[PDB]
Symmetry: C3
Subunit: 179 residues, 3 copies
Amino acid sequence: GAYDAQVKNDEQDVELADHEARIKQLRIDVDDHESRITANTKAITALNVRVTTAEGEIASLQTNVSALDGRVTTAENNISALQADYVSKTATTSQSLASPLNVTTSYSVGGKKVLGARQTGWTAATGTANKGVFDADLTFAVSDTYTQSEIQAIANALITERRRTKAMEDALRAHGLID
Amino acid sequence: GAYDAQVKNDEQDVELADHEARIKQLRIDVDDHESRITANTKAITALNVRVTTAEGEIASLQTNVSALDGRVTTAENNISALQADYVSKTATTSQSLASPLNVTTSYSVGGKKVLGARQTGWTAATGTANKGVFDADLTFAVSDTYTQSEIQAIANALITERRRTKAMEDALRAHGLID
Amino acid sequence: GAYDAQVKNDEQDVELADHEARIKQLRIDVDDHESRITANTKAITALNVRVTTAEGEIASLQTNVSALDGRVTTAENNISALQADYVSKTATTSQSLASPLNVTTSYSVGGKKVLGARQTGWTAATGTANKGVFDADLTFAVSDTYTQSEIQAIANALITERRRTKAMEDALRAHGLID
Ligand SMILES: [Ca+2]
Ligand SMILES: [Cl-]
């Protein structure tokens, strides 16, 4: 019917123009997606680098924290041991040592010197030591005339006195106050 | 004008061929974007897993570091307390205790034993103790003939001597050197 | 040849229909990619925030761990110093001080008081001190009749005895047991 071909060609041109416009817009979108996907991949790659670095610093930190925890626990136990075992300057309850003690120069009680270096130059007394009955209020009769028994009593008490002096000397030497 | 339809159909074919080529290239690009976007999403998902894990290890580390900081500070204060309060083996300035002290076996001064266990077996002296005037250069007259006053002087000095011995014994017992 | 134009227009319509279908599917894919790329970018942005935060917490942790390591090492050296230098309550080997020692109230050996505060009220003895030869088994002859030499011997031994008592008193005063 003569006219269809012009109508058909015209409408095909309309559809061709529509397709042309749609391809252009698709091309615009895909070209812009290209940039965006390229950018996203680059950022993801960069993100993996810093996270990998972070992972490398975390496991190292965890190692150090575990090592530190071990050294504090040891220190805490050494401190506990020292606290139970050390001699205090400020404690008021009597403190006792399981060992001998040596110090320089002096021992003191209440700020006054009571004990010091061993005193030397002694020649040790000989004979009997008297640690028995001793009456320092023992007195003596003295007559107007010579009495043997009265002189004997004086001599006897002089002997018990000298033997008491030796006994005391023995105690100082055995302690070590004198040589 | 007869010829236009062939010219029109030919140019439409040219445009159809152009569209065909452009759809192909778009299809190539979108198909390749599909893979890339799929890959990026998978990587992002995987990145969130490890970061979430990292966050889980950081806040735990921060907890442990804060706990460790607390235990060192306590330890540092215990150390400070021990340093101020402990008795030193190497310190040269005199050190003083606020408490009684007991040790095993001996006390010593300068490497020599000066004091030890209490000496036992003593029977305590009785009578007067003499801590007053005492002249150890006190001498005595002795005549060719018996003289009461001369014997009395000897006896008197024997008494003051025995009372001085008792006084000294009192001091050792009160300290505790003897029982 | 009359018929080609209808055949040509028909096949162009077929190709137009094919292009139309392909543009639709491309449009579907690109529209869906748009959402996905938008979502991926948003997630990447959000990932960078938390990683940046994580980086901010890691370098701070590394700072604290390094600071803690420094404080434990110092503490460990203070502990070592205390262990070598402190006086132990439980050690059995004799312990020695380089300094004088003062304590409250008493010194004790084996649980018994042996030493205490300085004894006062003494008037210092005068004269000769005897730290030489001393025989406490020295005895004396006593006749039925007055004998000057026998009385002299008693007096002489009384003098050496009093001088020995002074010698002992000197030792206690020099140590500090008495004033
Ligand atoms: Ca046509
Ligand atoms: Cl993407």
